[PDB]
Amino acid sequence: INDSKILSLQNKKNALVDTSGYNAEVRLEGDVQVNTIYTNDFKLSSSGDKIIVNLNNNILYSAIYENSSVSFWIKISKDLTNSHNEYTIINSIKQNSGWKLCIRNGNIEWILQDINRKYKSLIFDYSESLSHTGYTNKWFFVTITNNIMGYMKLYINGELKQSERIEDLDEVKLDKTIVFGIDENIDENQMLWIRDFNIFSKELSNEDINIVYEGQILRNVIKDYWGNPLKFDTEYYMINYNYIDRYIAPKNNILVLVQYSDISKLYTKNPITIKSAANKNPYSRILNGDDIMFHMLYDSREYMIIRDTDTIYATQGGQCSKNCVYALKLQSNLGNYGIGIFSIKNIVSQYCSQIFSSFMKNTMLLADIYKPWRFSFENAYTPVAVTNYETKLLSTSSFWKFISRDPGWVEHHHH
């Protein structure tokens, strides 16, 4: 695939440069922050922040005029996503013609415009009304393919979403200059990030688009809710996929999931931090298969989360051997205690992770409505460790996410 790359913006020796071999000029204006979350990323957060790319014009005398692909990841803040306005983000229109990428009312839009100012567009609603099921402030992978013989096509995370006919446009005059940046007035919380920006001189196959996607998602790296690398020490609101409006609370010596008082907020209560059981550095990336512990600062004391030794059902008398369900508890004695060591893994194939323990029996963490106190028949939404979990490996009840306080999603805690 890389053989057809005619532009590849990557961070080399602490600079954003073109590594394609064609040595495009890459000039940064304003105060563009680079390599803040991912190596090849850059942030557009102010009206003056611009990256100006000038390609060697001779590149345009090639298959690029007949077929091309553009790929990159993008992450758009909540406040920018919420705006009804239109913002040009990547501009390669000169003299009435070329292409551009815009954001408008929670959509991304790719525009191709001919020499008569007639244009065609691909539009994707990434916001879904700021739904937590949507992509607001989440990294997603974009790929546009263009073929003058037919269509331009928009792929999101490797999947075709939209197509538009372009064979009926008149001449398109491409320009050698690409300008990244927002010219409109934007508020302090309005910002976006792009990473791994590439242009190819061919129309990539579906298979090849997915190879680029899987390469660049970094399957080794567990992700937070937004698609950023998960890190040791960082505070996260840990949630089960099924219960995004609940927080983890100790109640009568176990942990349960309690609904936060403001149902519309992601940043709730009692964030956890993740610690390495293998002595990795503070704030280092958490990798697929890493052995970890969970800490929680609660009422001014630091605790570690442990699995209960006995199941939630008193009649099992500590002798359960199949379909065993264990509550989670807080322990004030901190250390590499086996009962509190877990393994974290990305979900085979399918920004969620699964969490396992191999202390005494193999278990997997899930959340469901149980009666988690041995002395009681009271029901609670409960995070539990269960054995014999083969049939639950595709259940969303086994999927966990970690919400960091991210600058692209701002909230203020009520009193």
**Whole-number Å distance between alpha carbons of 92 and 329:** 56
Name the amino acid, one letter, at 353: S
**Whole-number Å distance between alpha carbons of 404 and 41:** 19
Angle at 59 between CA 57 and CA 62, to 5 degrees: 130
Radius of gyration of the chain (CA): 24
Closest by CA to 145, choosing from 161, 134, 127, is 161
**Whole-number Å distance between alpha carbons of 98 and 79:** 29
Q: To 10 degrees, the CA torsion angle through 378, 379, 384, 389?
A: 120
Q: Specify the length of the chain in residues.
A: 415
* Determination technique for this entry: X-ray
CA 198 centroid distance within chain: 19
Class of domain 1-224: mainly beta
Closest by CA to 68, choosing from 214, 215, 166, is 166
- Is there a common fold for 1-224 and 225-415? no
**Whole-number Å distance between alpha carbons of 181 and 172:** 23
Closest by CA to 275, choosing from 304, 300, 237, 309, is 304
Give the single-character DSSP code of 184.
S
At 257, is the secondary structure helix, strand, or coil?
strand
Phi and psi at residue 108, in whole multiples of 5°? -100, 145
**3-state DSSP helix/strand/coil percent for the chain, to nearest 5?**
10, 45, 45
CB 51 within 8 A of CB 96: no
CB 130 within 8 A of CB 79: no
**Whole-number Å distance between alpha carbons of 266 and 270:** 12
How many C-beta atoms lie closer than 10 Å to residue 86's C-beta? 12
Structure tokens at 392: 């639950």
**Whole-number Å distance between alpha carbons of 25 and 11:** 14
CB 16 within 8 A of CB 9: yes
Structure tokens at 402: 């970690």
Residue spans per domain, the chain:
1-224, 225-415
Structure tokens at 195: 């990473």
Alpha helices in 148-257 (DSSP H): 206-216
CATH of region 225-415: 2.80.10.50
**Whole-number Å distance between alpha carbons of 9 and 26:** 8
How many C-beta atoms lie closer than 10 Å to residue 352's C-beta? 18
Name the amino acid, one letter, at 47: S
CA 249 centroid distance within chain: 26
**Whole-number Å distance between alpha carbons of 192 and 22:** 27
Closest by CA to 366, choosing from 349, 352, 376, 350, is 352
